[PDB]
Write a protein that binds this ligand. Structure first.
Ligand SMILES: Cc1cnc(-c2ccccc2C(C)C)nc1NCc1ccc(-n2ccnn2)cc1
Ligand SMILES: [Zn+2]
Lengths: 312, 77
């Protein structure tokens, strides 16, 4: 169809498909849109236009699938125009696009303040970074915000729990990377560990599916679980667990080009299924079937790149 | 002047000796010396914000034990 041009911005489409199905994101955008309307800002205005456009498409898809194909091709130019205005960025990185959109919304909220905490409540957490000098055994702490967790995918079949351990478990920095202890006034070996203090509603895992010797893409994925618990690396005991609801995958043999696809979970009959977005095509999938396709044992061509977990 | 940490592509932490007045491109040159990744292919994230070239470390309130996260660009379209 005429929607074939959708493929060019597949980095943006995957991020906007994930944000549309995030719990509370489109409610937060509407709340900001209402405030801006009576204030009389383009990012909020174009986002609300996109959400209404998708809402009309989604409603038609549910009720009359035959006329969904017609309406999807009735005015494709309208949909493509709002994506050109909404693009915050060639071929680009999906995680970088998400960082730009979320940063733009955050700046609008802060400027509007001077409901206004949409990004912070949804995507922003807090880390506690501890360093322990192996000579004097003194502890120094740093507090840093985070919006997403960057974990490795190979050591240099592995699970996501191994990847987070590489991120947050105690690491010993030695040799050329000796810590400089102010107490010892000397270079000493040290142990670094990361802990989660404040927890966002949505947990984003940025998989480093790329390596350096010269840069190459790692096609082998990790064993992604449906349930995620961060109690192993948390400052306090928490019974809160997280469930996977969105996956952004990258197809290609290199890091310099490829295609982005997004798989999201519906939260009727469709509730509990996974929607696979491929340019202009949408496929409803069972949770059992989608998870098998993610298995590294099947050698998927689409490499998982971003995982999204919502608090239960 | 101060020693910051960088988490590399494999999750391993390396250390950098930098100045508060150091530009971002200067830090990327220091990372290339230890990791071998060209500065144009590097993305540095501090406290959830990507560090843009032309700014300095003092602009981002980067202190001694601050941790930068090093990621690449996985381009797609
Ligand atoms: C073809 C297509 C591709 N992208 C998107 C889309 C979705 C969300 C946010 C942004 C976008 C685009 C515009 C960037 N939407 C599409 N089609 C509409 C649609 C929507 C929902 C469903 N659906 C089925 C069961 N629950 N919802 C079915 C069809
Ligand atoms: Zn010491």
């Amino acid at each position: 169809v005429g929607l074939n041009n959708l493929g060019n911005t597949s980095y943006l489409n995957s991020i906007l498909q994930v944000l549309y199905f995030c719990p509370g994101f489109k409610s937060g955008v509407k709340h900001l849109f209402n405030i801006i309307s009576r204030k009389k800002y383009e990012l909020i205005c174009s986002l609300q236009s996109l959400i209404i456009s998708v809402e009309q498409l989604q409603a038609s898809f549910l009720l009359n699938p035959e006329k969904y194909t017609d309406e999807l091709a009735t005015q494709p130019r309208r949909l493509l125009n709002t994506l050109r205005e909404l693009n915050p960025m060639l071929q680009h990185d999906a995680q970088e696009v998400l960082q730009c959109i979320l940063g733009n919304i955050q700046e609008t909220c802060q400027l509007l303040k001077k409901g206004f905490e949409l990004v912070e409540k949804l995507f922003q957490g807090q880390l506690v970074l501890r360093t322990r000098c192996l000579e004097c055994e003194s502890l120094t702490e740093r507090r840093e915000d985070f919006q997403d967790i960057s974990v490795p995918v190979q050591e240099d079949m592995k699970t996501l729990r191994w990847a987070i351990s590489q991120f947050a478990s105690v690491e010993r920095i030695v040799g050329e990377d000796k810590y400089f202890c102010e107490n010892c006034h000397h270079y000493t070996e040290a142990e670094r560990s990361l802990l989660f203090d404040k927890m966002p509603e949505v947990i984003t895992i940025h998989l480093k599916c790329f390596a350096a010797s010269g840069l190459s893409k790692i096609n082998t994925p990790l064993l992604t679980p449906l349930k995620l618990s961060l109690e192993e690396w948390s400052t306090k005991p928490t019974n809160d667990s997280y469930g996977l609801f969105a996956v952004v995958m990258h197809s290609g043999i290199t890091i310099s080009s490829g295609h982005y696809t997004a798989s999201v979970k519906v939260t009727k009959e469709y509730e509990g299924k996974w929607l696979l977005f491929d340019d202009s095509e949408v496929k409803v999938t069972e949770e059992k079937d989608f998870l098998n396709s993610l298995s590294p044992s099947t050698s998927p061509t689409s490499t998982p790149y971003l995982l999204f977990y919502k608090k239960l | 002047s101060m020693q910051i940490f960088v988490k590399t592509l494999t999750g391993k932490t390396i250390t950098l000796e930098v100045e508060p007045s150091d530009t971002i491109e200067n830090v990327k040159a220091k990372i290339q010396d230890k990791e071998g990744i060209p500065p144009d292919q590097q993305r540095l994230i501090f406290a959830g914000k990507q560090l843009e070239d032309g700014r300095t470390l003092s602009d981002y309130n980067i202190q001694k034990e601050s941790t930068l996260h090093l990621v690449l660009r996985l381009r797609g379209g």
